[PDB]
Amino acid sequence: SNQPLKIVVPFSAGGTADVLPRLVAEKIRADYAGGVIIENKPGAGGNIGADLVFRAPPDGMTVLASPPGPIAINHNLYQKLSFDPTRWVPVTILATVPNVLVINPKLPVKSLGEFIAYAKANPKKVTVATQGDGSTSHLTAAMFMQLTGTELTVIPYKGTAPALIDLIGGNVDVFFDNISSSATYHQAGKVRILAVADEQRSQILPQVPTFAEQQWPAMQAVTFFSVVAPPGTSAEIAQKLQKQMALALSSNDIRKHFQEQGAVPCGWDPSKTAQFIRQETEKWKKVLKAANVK
Ligand SMILES: O=C(O)c1ccc(C(=O)O)cc1
């Protein structure tokens, strides 16, 4: 078709939600006469761009590349959504990535223990950025507060990218971002990452310990980036698109870029993708209850 493939990322450009489909989009451009364009449609925790793709023609030329918010979390948190995430047509999972605790380095804090005490001394004073209500950074922050007894004031953003800008600029204190987008700044000293919310360390930040190592093993928060087609999209179209992307994800160049920012390439078929989204939808639903989020 002379039309381009429209991949909608419902978060600000500059974060992991943007860069992973963008890297893959470049590899699959030869598959489409009209090309492959990324469209950034941020706002409302990813629901604006999500609603946009949800209403798009089910022809497989408009798709949503999104982290879990609009995919597996928002419908169990928001009072009413204009779309039903259980009706997405799964294409594939691009990658899973662990979340980490990022702080502004100018805070008088160099460890988790110091941070917890620093927040407990003044409840509500320490501000925590999020990528929007229902994002994993939101639920990971709430998860953290439940386990530690700290009280952080949530500040939502249209994505990781504007949140990091403010964090580095001293306008927001902490951020439970995913490691991929924050590691770039940690190496340059622009931020300080205190811990990884995963069972193993990440090899891009070998010195940053897991929460579990720091004796907070209940801090387990791994996000994932999915590709979904509008409701009604045929299984053939979704499968042909997942194969195109699975081919991209298997190349050395993409594996290298993914590996180097701590992203784990997946590329599963739509059926395994569908199961995984069910498993994750259930996982985060329990986090919603256990930390009662809002
Ligand atoms: O919900 C998440 O985990 C998530 C949200 C936004 C972004 C981004 O703005 O790149 C990345 C991850």
63 exposure class (CB count in 10 Å sphere: 0-12, 13-18, 19+): buried
71 CB-near residues (< 8 Å, 6+ apart): 85, 88, 226, 228, 277
Q: How far is the CA of 171 from the centre of ligand 1 (A)?
A: 19
Residue nearest to ligand 1 atom 11, measured at CA: 17
Question: Residue 87, Cα to own-chain centre: how many angstroms?
Answer: 20
Breaks (C-N over 2.5 A) in the chain follow: none
Q: Residues 116, 206: one domain?
A: yes
- Tell me if 263 sits within 8 A of 16, measured CB to CB: yes
The terminus-to-terminus CA distance of the chain in angstroms comes to 43
Reading the block at residue 217, the tokens are 């093993």
Q: Residues 258, 175: one domain?
A: no
| 178 Cβ closer than 6 Å to some ligand 1 atom | yes
Q: How far is the CA of 2 from the centre of ligand 1 (A)?
A: 31
Cβ count within 10 A of residue 226: 24
Q: Residues 233, 167: one domain?
A: no
Q: Residues 229, 152: one domain?
A: no
- Tell me if 195 sits within 8 A of 103, measured CB to CB: no
User: Which strands form 5-9's sheet, in the order they lie side by side?
Assistant: 36-40, 5-9, 62-66, 222-229, 89-98, 264-265
Q: How far is the CA of 201 from the centre of ligand 1 (A)?
A: 20
- Of the candidates 205, 221, 237, which is a domain's last residue? 221
Cβ count within 10 A of residue 33: 9
Instruction: Tell me the three-class secondary structure of the chain, residue by residue.
Output: CCCCEEEEECCCCCCHHHHHHHHHHHHCHHHCCCCEEEEECCCHHHHHHHHHHHCCCCCCCEEEEECCHHHHHHHHCCCCCCCCHHHCEEEEEEEEEEEEEEECCCCCCCCHHHHHHHHHHCCCCCEEEECCCCCHHHHHHHHHHHHHCCCCEEEECCCHHHHHHHHHCCCCCEECCEHHHHHHHHHCCCCEEEEECCCCCCCCCCCCCECCCCCCCCCCCEEEEEEEECCCCCHHHHHHHHHHHHHHHHCHHHHHHHHHCCCEECCCCHHHHHHHHHHHHHHHHHHHHHCCCC
Task: Using alpha carbons, select from 36, 67, 64, 37 the residue that is nearest to residue 50.
Answer: 64
Query: The tokens 């360390």 sit on which residue?
Result: 201
Q: How far is the CA of 185 from the centre of ligand 1 (A)?
A: 16
Resolution (A): 2.4
Reading the block at residue 259, the tokens are 């590996």
- Tell me if 268 sits within 8 A of 90, measured CB to CB: no
Task: Using alpha carbons, select from 190, 184, 136 the residue that is nearest to residue 167.
Answer: 190
CA distance 246 to 174: 35
- Tell me if 116 sits within 8 A of 122, measured CB to CB: no
Task: Using alpha carbons, select from 46, 84, 68 the residue that is nearest to residue 232.
Answer: 84
Q: Residues 44, 108: one domain?
A: no
- Tell me if 204 sits within 8 A of 262, measured CB to CB: yes
| 136 Cβ closer than 6 Å to some ligand 1 atom | yes
Q: How far is the CA of 159 from the centre of ligand 1 (A)?
A: 6
207 exposure class (CB count in 10 Å sphere: 0-12, 13-18, 19+): exposed
Question: Residue 23, Cα to own-chain centre: how many angstroms?
Answer: 16
Identity of the residue numbered 129: A
- Tell me if 266 sits within 8 A of 255, measured CB to CB: no
Mutation to probe ligand 1, out of 11, 66, 96, 102 (largest number of atoms < 8 A from CB): 11
69 exposure class (CB count in 10 Å sphere: 0-12, 13-18, 19+): buried
User: Which strands form 192-196's sheet, in the order they lie side by side?
Assistant: 153-156, 127-130, 174-175, 100-103, 192-196
Q: Residues 92, 226: one domain?
A: yes
- Tell me if 46 sits within 8 A of 228, measured CB to CB: no
| 140 Cβ closer than 6 Å to some ligand 1 atom | no
- Of the candidates 221, 242, 263, which is a domain's last residue? 221
Q: How far is the CA of 142 from the centre of ligand 1 (A)?
A: 16
Reading the block at residue 194, the tokens are 């205190």
- Of the candidates 168, 203, 221, which is a domain's last residue? 221
Q: How many domains are contained in the chain?
A: 2
Q: Residues 89, 36: one domain?
A: yes
Q: How far is the CA of 131 from the centre of ligand 1 (A)?
A: 6
| 95 Cβ closer than 6 Å to some ligand 1 atom | no
Q: Which atom of ligand 1 is nearest to the CA of 42?
A: 9
Q: Residues 87, 102: one domain?
A: no
β-pair type (89-98, 264-265): antiparallel
| 159 Cβ closer than 6 Å to some ligand 1 atom | yes
β-pair type (174-175, 100-103): antiparallel
Q: Residues 44, 121: one domain?
A: no
Q: Residues 229, 214: one domain?
A: no
β-pair type (127-130, 153-156): parallel
Question: Residue 55, Cα to own-chain centre: how many angstroms?
Answer: 23
Q: Which residues of 152-168 are buried (b: 16+ CB within 10 A; e: fewer)?
A: bebbbbbbbbbbbebbb
Structural domain for 88, as ranges:
1-97+222-294
Q: Residues 86, 228: one domain?
A: yes
Residue nearest to ligand 1 atom 9, measured at CA: 159
Task: Using alpha carbons, select from 99, 50, 56, 98 the residue that is nearest to residue 75.
Answer: 50
Q: Residues 27, 89: one domain?
A: yes
